[PDB]
Amino acid sequence: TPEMPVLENRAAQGDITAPGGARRLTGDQTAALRDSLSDKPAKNIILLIGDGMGDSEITAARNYAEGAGGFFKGIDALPLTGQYTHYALNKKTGKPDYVTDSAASATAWSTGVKTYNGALGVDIHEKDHPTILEMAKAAGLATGNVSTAELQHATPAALVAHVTSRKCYGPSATSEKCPGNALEKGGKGSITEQLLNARADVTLGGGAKTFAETATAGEWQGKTLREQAQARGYQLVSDAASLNSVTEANQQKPLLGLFADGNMPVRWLGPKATYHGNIDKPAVTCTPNPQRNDSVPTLAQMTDKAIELLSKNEKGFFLQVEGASIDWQDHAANPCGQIGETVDLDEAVQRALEFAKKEGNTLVIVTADHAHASQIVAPDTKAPGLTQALNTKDGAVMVMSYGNSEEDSQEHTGSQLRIAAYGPHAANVVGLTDQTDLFYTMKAALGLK
Amino acid sequence: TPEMPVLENRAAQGDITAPGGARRLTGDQTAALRDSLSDKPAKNIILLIGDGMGDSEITAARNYAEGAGGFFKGIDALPLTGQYTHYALNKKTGKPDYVTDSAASATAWSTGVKTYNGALGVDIHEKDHPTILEMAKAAGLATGNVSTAELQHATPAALVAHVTSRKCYGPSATSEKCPGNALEKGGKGSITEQLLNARADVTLGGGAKTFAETATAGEWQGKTLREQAQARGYQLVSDAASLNSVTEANQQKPLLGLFADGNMPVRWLGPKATYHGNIDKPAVTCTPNPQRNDSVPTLAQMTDKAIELLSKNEKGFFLQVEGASIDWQDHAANPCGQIGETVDLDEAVQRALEFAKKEGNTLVIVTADHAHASQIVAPDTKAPGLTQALNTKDGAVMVMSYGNSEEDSQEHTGSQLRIAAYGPHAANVVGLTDQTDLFYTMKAALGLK
Ligand SMILES: [Co+2]
Ligand SMILES: [Co+2]
Ligand SMILES: [Co+2]
Ligand SMILES: [Co+2]
Ligand SMILES: [Co+2]
Ligand SMILES: [Co+2]
């Protein structure tokens, strides 16, 4: 009977065409919300990020996978909610830049300082700031960094690398685009070199491609980054079997799961949206990606396994899980890809809430780094961008529009967006907050001195 | 100090380029939120609707008028927040229609039943359902209905009229489009005729034009609707000074303020966004509309006057206030008009919160009927639709994009959106809810049975 309740059912209660049939509430919530408030310490924190998962992305995925009156048992089940701002800074002027990229936003919640687009773990003066994961490890807590994206990708890379440009994946890119970060120039090195130095306990995702690179200097000069990883004691897994037979993860044998050369496989496939696609082409039903595999751990599986391995630390743990390709698919104007990745994240959120509700001292937060392009529009819409009609769980058509770029990729947008939480200190996400407040919220809930 | 706190400040606390400077919080919110939870009765309710005011609209307006790290002392200050769904229904199938218009959404929170786009006060079978305003009046509470739109517009009209199409403004359009509701055919009459019957204690807004039409039947056949109101005991006012002179409003002497022929004047002027407007043109600075006026009451003034007149009822009151032109200007791809109307709504929200914190038993809710088109995008965006660069309070450029219609009007979008509240029973807007839950939340808070 976990004192702090997870919402069990906020689907429409009945017949949506009848008075009250679309209500998601069965009665007053004052007592349940009083019950969801505690300022006791967070022993653990699990932060899940849906990259580019603004309210529009949440709504479109729900409409399609669960119906308009449906309910995500993970994403929609956190009882304390608010909206936060994620604007970045113009590097030269220090004024706001209203639409952040992935790097500046992830720098914001992981360091508590606003920065310029493309920066990771540094401010507009290129000065390094400690990340919540670096700080959690320093305090003796176990640390996890999970993502379906390549690990050099901004979201999980911000927790372990401090570079002046997110493009500095390896020695090569670094020496070129982050000259002062390049190892052979006295800096701390490429994103992957600093990730190896950071040494979290559990690091799972894709991005094996960069590890085939060789250090230009340093103790492991000439050796490949994977060679360097093997040499520094890391426990390297590459598939679901090898990951599941892992029984422990610590500093002596930190875990590095490289499940793909680049990003991990998307869950669902569909045609890309097109000009007047909702008018000129048939409504679409998403299809399961045949190449996604029971040999590749799902986000939910990587989450569960990271939780099992991190919860053995009695001091506690900090874990960040990213459903990364929601952003990727929204950029590609591919509704099916995008929605399937939201559905993927919801399964990981359910594993987190199921663990937190039993454990009792776990603060779980679900949010996104920034908003995105996709909009849900009327079925008859004639829009200038890319559109597509989808057959939803309701047996009705929903049309999605991508209308903010004539270029190859659709763009991020600056709208404030949902952040939701459950457990100790979850009140700190309610109302209007800033993305940097989340750093302070996590740091304080863990009591990191 | 009335135990329930209104947020005093959620702006960035310091230098946004420094660690912690972008924080909107100054410490833990658990105690603050516990103090914001009460399940005692709401003696009064003030519902403020920004038409089309989704999170994107709130953010764009805050970024322009208050700076990225600024704070809307009204809109951003409600402590309990959540996200609600506003889908309508397809009339024929009864399945969800993912993008509602203003009529079906206002019908949903005012009656508690989902309906089809364009319906007012009736369900998909065209059955009338009592509204929260009619129920309040039936229980002896005073009632107010305020809007900057013409009063026949969907948002205020849904509280007092039951017609099969929102276009049925007066006798002529009702005869043509809602034959079943036409007075000469045995129906309840046009929107304006039903509004005159509903007899709220205070009704203020635009829409004088339709009152020049004459009734086709009934006791006032052949007389204009304005002559009808006069003969029925209404006190008619048409400007700021006549409204100010009003001393009481009740069933014997109900107040009807008609301040414009159509919609009331927008607060700010600016050019319409254009194709590649952010590449091809210089940035826009909004400017006050000369056509505003000390002779035209502002939304904040109409809100205050309504509060003063309705609070003389010892049993309590229900008041809806609509900032209407946010929607009109978002459809017109006019950033300045759109933002100025959000600033306008923020002032009315402040008046409502100021009253509520002092009174202690008033539930204030602030939300929108549906989301809209506008998106905040990167300055160098090259988009297919209409865009505009704007000079914000920060001394930086923000670019807005309207990209969902090649047609003249930009359109509504289906994303769930913010709903926020303050006062008794405010917990009921937190987490995921449906727009129809708002009807039940209001009914229960006032203890209407
Ligand atoms: Co991102
Ligand atoms: Co990411
Ligand atoms: Co992106
Ligand atoms: Co509307
Ligand atoms: Co309206
Ligand atoms: Co509209």
Side-chain angles (χ1 to χ4, degrees):
Chain A
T1 167
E3 185 60 299
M4 294 192 272
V6 296
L7 295 178
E8 235 138 63
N9 187 2
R10 287 211 175 169
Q13 59 133 124
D15 172 359
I16 65 177
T17 75
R23 292 167 67 187
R24 299 187 188 275
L25 298 187
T26 59
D28 196 81
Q29 298 298 301
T30 306
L33 232 34
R34 273 164 182 165
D35 293 354
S36 293
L37 293 167
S38 148
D39 59 3
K40 293 62 175 220
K43 177 180 196 264
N44 312 298
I45 293 187
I46 299 161
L47 169 61
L48 294 106
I49 300 287
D51 203 297
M53 193 185 69
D55 288 279
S56 180
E57 289 63 28
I58 293 172
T59 310
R62 187 192 302 110
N63 287 345
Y64 181 92
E66 308 285 349
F71 169 73
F72 275 132
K73 288 181 303 107
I75 293 171
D76 290 331
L78 292 90
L80 291 162
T81 48
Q83 298 80 35
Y84 80 171
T85 51
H86 42 78
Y87 59 94
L89 301 184
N90 175 271
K91 189 183 185 179
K92 288 185 190 94
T93 71
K95 288 167 174 177
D97 177 346
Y98 309 97
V99 180
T100 189
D101 74 334
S102 268
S105 40
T107 291
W109 77 68
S110 67
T111 67
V113 201
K114 292 287 189 185
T115 189
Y116 60 97
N117 281 346
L120 289 172
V122 305
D123 61 19
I124 59 171
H125 310 302
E126 298 182 346
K127 171 179 195 182
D128 293 8
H129 295 263
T131 81
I132 187 70
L133 191 156
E134 292 169 335
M135 294 159 69
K137 184 180 181 184
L141 264 44
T143 53
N145 192 178
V146 174
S147 176
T148 47
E150 47 200 15
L151 294 158
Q152 296 77 190
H153 172 52
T155 309
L159 295 175
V160 302
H162 304 272
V163 290
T164 61
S165 166
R166 57 187 295 178
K167 286 186 181 177
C168 298
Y169 283 17
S172 161
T174 304
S175 298
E176 171 173 38
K177 7 206 72 177
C178 298
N181 284 135
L183 196 61
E184 81 275 1
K185 278 136 149 179
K188 312 179 196 249
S190 66
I191 282 159
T192 315
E193 290 160 296
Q194 301 180 47
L195 180 163
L196 286 178
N197 296 334
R199 193 190 201 73
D201 292 303
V202 174
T203 298
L204 308 175
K209 158 146 165 290
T210 300
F211 288 78
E213 259 187 273
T214 56
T216 65
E219 166 161 358
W220 304 271
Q221 175 170 166
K223 299 308 175 61
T224 211
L225 253 19
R226 181 177 226 275
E227 262 162 6
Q228 165 181 172
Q230 263 148 171
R232 310 175 56 176
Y234 280 96
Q235 181 180 188
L236 307 168
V237 297
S238 76
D239 55 54
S242 62
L243 165 64
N244 192 230
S245 63
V246 172
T247 46
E248 88 214 43
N250 45 57
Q251 280 63 208
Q252 5 295 344
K253 53 175 50 182
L255 176 54
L256 181 46
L258 292 161
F259 302 115
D261 218 73
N263 299 316
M264 292 177 56
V266 302
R267 201 198 175 91
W268 292 359
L269 297 187
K272 172 178 197 179
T274 53
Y275 178 76
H276 284 183
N278 58 305
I279 305 295
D280 305 350
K281 298 174 63 187
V284 171
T285 297
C286 303
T287 50
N289 174 8
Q291 296 181 276
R292 79 195 186 182
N293 331 292
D294 67 19
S295 90
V296 180
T298 61
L299 186 57
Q301 291 177 319
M302 285 197 291
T303 293
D304 260 342
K305 183 60 161 172
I307 286 178
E308 294 175 8
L309 295 176
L310 308 162
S311 60
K312 291 354 289 167
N313 185 124
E314 250 45 273
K315 226 310 189 81
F317 70 86
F318 161 81
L319 170 68
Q320 173 172 290
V321 179
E322 173 196 30
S325 299
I326 296 185
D327 177 70
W328 186 266
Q329 299 300 132
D330 212 313
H331 273 300
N334 192 298
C336 285
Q338 177 194 310
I339 288 163
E341 295 307 88
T342 305
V343 170
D344 192 37
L345 179 74
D346 173 71
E347 296 189 334
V349 174
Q350 291 180 55
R351 297 302 82 77
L353 296 166
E354 279 158 13
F355 169 78
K357 176 186 182 183
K358 301 330 157 315
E359 194 285 326
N361 303 287
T362 299
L363 167 60
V364 181
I365 293 157
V366 183
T367 186
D369 54 348
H370 56 65
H372 222 300
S374 79
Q375 306 187 305
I376 302 160
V377 295
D380 41 78
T381 294
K382 267 190 176 58
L386 308 180
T387 54
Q388 183 168 87
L390 296 150
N391 297 126
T392 74
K393 188 182 188 50
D394 292 313
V397 169
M398 171 175 69
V399 173
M400 285 171 75
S401 171
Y402 295 84
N404 66 17
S405 189
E406 286 177 323
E407 238 306 286
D408 284 338
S409 296
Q410 287 298 303
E411 24 245 328
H412 294 177
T413 56
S415 180
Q416 66 192 19
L417 58 82
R418 172 186 198 251
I419 169 163
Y422 167 73
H425 293 290
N428 295 326
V429 307
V430 181
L432 176 70
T433 64
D434 187 72
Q435 192 162 57
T436 60
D437 284 296
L438 186 51
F439 166 75
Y440 289 96
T441 284
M442 295 186 298
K443 184 179 84 59
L446 285 179
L448 309 183
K449 308 289 196 212
Chain B
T1 309
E3 281 199 66
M4 290 182 279
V6 171
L7 302 174
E8 299 170 309
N9 192 307
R10 285 277 178 107
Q13 296 304 117
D15 176 358
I16 62 174
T17 72
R23 296 171 64 193
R24 301 184 179 276
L25 302 180
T26 57
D28 199 80
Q29 304 295 306
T30 308
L33 234 42
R34 294 176 168 141
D35 290 353
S36 298
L37 298 165
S38 162
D39 66 0
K40 63 167 183 294
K43 176 174 171 189
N44 311 309
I45 287 182
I46 305 172
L47 172 60
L48 295 116
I49 300 290
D51 199 309
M53 196 191 66
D55 286 274
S56 177
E57 279 67 32
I58 290 176
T59 310
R62 187 193 297 116
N63 288 342
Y64 182 89
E66 301 286 359
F71 172 72
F72 273 134
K73 295 179 175 178
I75 295 173
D76 294 332
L78 287 107
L80 290 171
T81 50
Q83 287 87 200
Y84 79 171
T85 52
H86 44 71
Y87 61 91
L89 298 177
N90 179 266
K91 194 179 183 184
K92 281 158 171 168
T93 72
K95 292 165 177 188
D97 179 347
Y98 306 99
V99 188
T100 190
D101 71 339
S102 296
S105 54
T107 291
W109 77 68
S110 65
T111 65
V113 200
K114 297 278 192 182
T115 191
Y116 59 92
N117 284 342
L120 283 175
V122 306
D123 62 22
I124 62 177
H125 306 298
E126 302 184 344
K127 169 185 178 184
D128 293 358
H129 288 275
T131 77
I132 189 68
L133 182 144
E134 295 165 335
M135 292 157 58
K137 169 155 159 179
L141 309 194
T143 49
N145 190 6
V146 176
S147 178
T148 54
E150 50 212 354
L151 293 163
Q152 296 81 19
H153 169 64
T155 317
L159 292 184
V160 299
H162 304 270
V163 292
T164 58
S165 172
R166 62 182 295 170
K167 289 183 185 188
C168 294
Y169 277 27
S172 165
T174 301
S175 291
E176 176 69 19
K177 307 176 174 304
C178 303
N181 301 136
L183 203 71
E184 71 275 8
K185 291 192 178 186
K188 300 178 242 296
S190 62
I191 284 168
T192 299
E193 281 165 301
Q194 290 190 49
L195 175 153
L196 282 181
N197 291 327
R199 202 183 184 87
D201 298 294
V202 174
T203 302
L204 304 174
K209 186 179 180 212
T210 308
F211 287 83
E213 290 196 46
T214 62
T216 63
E219 182 173 347
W220 307 277
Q221 176 175 167
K223 297 306 88 188
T224 57
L225 262 17
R226 173 182 292 275
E227 278 162 356
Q228 169 169 159
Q230 183 69 210
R232 289 179 82 173
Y234 277 89
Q235 52 194 313
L236 296 164
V237 297
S238 64
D239 61 22
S242 48
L243 172 58
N244 204 248
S245 287
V246 172
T247 46
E248 64 176 321
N250 48 54
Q251 297 298 291
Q252 298 62 229
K253 308 177 41 71
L255 181 57
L256 178 57
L258 289 179
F259 303 110
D261 190 61
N263 301 319
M264 293 173 68
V266 299
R267 186 175 186 117
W268 290 353
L269 301 173
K272 179 181 186 88
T274 53
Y275 177 71
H276 293 170
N278 61 306
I279 311 300
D280 303 359
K281 278 147 185 49
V284 168
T285 294
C286 306
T287 194
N289 178 7
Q291 291 276 211
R292 270 149 40 156
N293 265 179
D294 52 54
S295 83
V296 187
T298 60
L299 186 63
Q301 292 175 335
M302 293 189 290
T303 299
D304 259 346
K305 191 57 178 188
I307 289 173
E308 159 197 314
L309 297 167
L310 301 165
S311 67
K312 155 59 221 295
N313 187 304
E314 28 209 47
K315 257 195 79 111
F317 66 84
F318 171 77
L319 170 61
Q320 179 178 287
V321 179
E322 185 196 15
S325 289
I326 291 166
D327 180 66
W328 168 32
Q329 303 292 143
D330 210 315
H331 280 295
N334 193 287
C336 289
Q338 177 197 307
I339 291 168
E341 294 313 88
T342 308
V343 164
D344 195 54
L345 181 71
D346 171 74
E347 295 178 349
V349 174
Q350 293 187 50
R351 291 324 128 218
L353 290 177
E354 280 165 9
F355 166 80
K357 181 168 191 136
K358 170 168 199 173
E359 195 286 328
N361 301 284
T362 295
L363 170 59
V364 179
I365 299 150
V366 175
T367 186
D369 53 346
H370 53 72
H372 216 303
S374 82
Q375 294 186 309
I376 299 158
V377 296
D380 70 348
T381 293
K382 206 92 146 191
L386 312 172
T387 56
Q388 181 167 98
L390 293 128
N391 293 309
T392 72
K393 166 117 186 263
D394 300 306
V397 173
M398 173 174 69
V399 174
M400 287 174 71
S401 175
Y402 296 85
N404 65 19
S405 183
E406 306 179 284
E407 323 200 292
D408 283 59
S409 165
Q410 291 295 310
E411 294 310 335
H412 297 178
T413 61
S415 180
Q416 60 191 23
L417 54 87
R418 182 175 187 251
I419 166 167
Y422 171 75
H425 296 284
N428 294 327
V429 312
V430 183
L432 179 72
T433 62
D434 188 71
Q435 190 166 58
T436 57
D437 287 299
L438 179 58
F439 169 80
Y440 288 90
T441 286
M442 292 186 294
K443 180 192 184 173
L446 290 165
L448 305 180
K449 262 317 297 294

